[PDB]
């Protein structure tokens, strides 16, 4: 069923 | 283990080159053309079964760009150590004269992901029908890439895949000719 999902990366400790 | 799907992305400086792709058991499912901002499926027929909205990748690349800047500095600016590629040229199947075949140039175990590849026909560069893959991840964190040259077997010409990478003292020409 269609939508190929993806994860996103979080922001590095600056 | 049965399978492994891998979502792989990278951002490189100073090139400012980024990449977003999926990998099933070593094979690229699709990658997002950052410039055209579009999903490109490895096999056309894959896009008739699934959908991927490209804008998401583009967002992901942005966080990557950002995080890279943080890390570069965090590392006291330690730059990447070039690792020149291993190059191999082969064909899709057993060559038979006057039997259309495909020359595969396999570039492996390199970093960073920047390479210049030329197909030379009797020393002159060939572009007709060529194609290549994007940078495929490797468990060691180096990359893989393939270049393809459809050709008609003959005893009249020799072939070389010319690869240029920062970790190579000089351009590497891998040869192929029909026996």
């Amino acid at each position: 069923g269609s939508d190929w999902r993806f994860l996103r990366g979080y922001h590095q400790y600056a | 283990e049965e399978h492994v799907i891998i979502q792989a992305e990278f951002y490189l400086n100073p090139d400012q080159s980024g990449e977003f792709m999926f990998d099933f058991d070593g094979d690229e499912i699709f990658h997002v053309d950052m410039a055209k901002k579009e999903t490109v499926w490895r096999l056309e027929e894959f896009g008739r079964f699934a959908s991927f909205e490209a804008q998401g990748a583009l967002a992901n690349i942005a966080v990557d760009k950002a995080n890279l800047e943080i890390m570069t500095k965090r590392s006291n600016y330690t730059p990447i150590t070039n690792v020149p590629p291993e190059v191999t040229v082969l064909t899709n199947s057993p060559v038979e004269l006057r039997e259309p075949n495909v020359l595969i140039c396999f570039i492996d175990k390199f970093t960073p992901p920047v390479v210049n590849v030329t197909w030379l026909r009797n020393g002159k560069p060939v572009t007709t029908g060529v194609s290549e893959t994007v940078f495929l991840p490797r468990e060691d964190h180096l990359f893989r890439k393939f270049h393809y040259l459809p050709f008609l077997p003959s005893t009249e010409d020799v072939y070389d895949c010319r690869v240029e990478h920062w970790g190579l003292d000089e351009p590497l020409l891998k040869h192929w000719e029909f026996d």
């Binding site: 979080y10 | 049965e2 891998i6 490189l12």
Partner: protein, 187 residues
């Protein structure tokens, strides 16, 4: 000019279908993996000291940990689900060719080449037989070669000294076929 590279990878490892699934998020600076999330661990861990900040920090953010802990279903099992028809079930049959590597006339050592190509998936068994008996020694294989276009190829060679009327057979077993493929070569 120096290059600096950043990579982020999300790996979904499937065992016995989606019975067992493991998700790994890895951050790699240049060629060193600095921090990773392992579903079997439940939280981030610094792989190298350059990633310690991130591990400390991301483990603090607790929305982010819950999100990841659940990616095994929302992300991993979902995408397997969506992809299964064209990936897990892909099945291309191998082209099997048999030929002597050199045209060096009878009773002289020769390498018989069994070329198996264009197959998908990767697993396959190529065996050599002489006069119906299986030949296990003197076999030189290139191993599986991934072509980067959803097809594989392999070349399995048999060291022979063909005598007249010897019948050599390459037998290929692959999921894309019900009964083993065989090609014979008559000395």
């Amino acid at each position: 000019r120096p290059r600096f590279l950043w990579q982020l990878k999300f790996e979904c490892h499937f065992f016995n279908g989606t019975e067992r699934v493991r998700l790994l998020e890895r951050c790699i600076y240049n060629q060193e993996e600095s921090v990773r999330f392992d579903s079997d661990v439940g939280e981030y861990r610094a792989v190298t000291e350059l990633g310690r900040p991130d591990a400390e920090y991301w483990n603090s953010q607790k929305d982010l940990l819950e999100q990841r802990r659940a990616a095994v279903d929302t992300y991993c099992r979902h995408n397997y689900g969506v992809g299964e028809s064209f990936t897990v079930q892909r099945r291309v049959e191998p082209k099997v060719t048999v030929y002597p590597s050199k045209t060096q006339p009878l009773q002289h050592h020769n390498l018989l080449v069994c070329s198996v190509s264009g197959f998908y998936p990767g697993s396959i068994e190529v065996r050599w037989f002489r006069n119906g008996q299986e030949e296990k020694a003197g076999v030189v294989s290139t191993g599986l070669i991934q072509n980067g276009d959803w097809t594989f190829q392999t070349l399995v060679m048999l060291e022979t000294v063909p005598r007249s009327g010897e019948v050599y057979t390459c037998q290929v077993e692959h999921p894309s076929v019900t009964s083993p493929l065989t090609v014979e070569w008559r000395a």
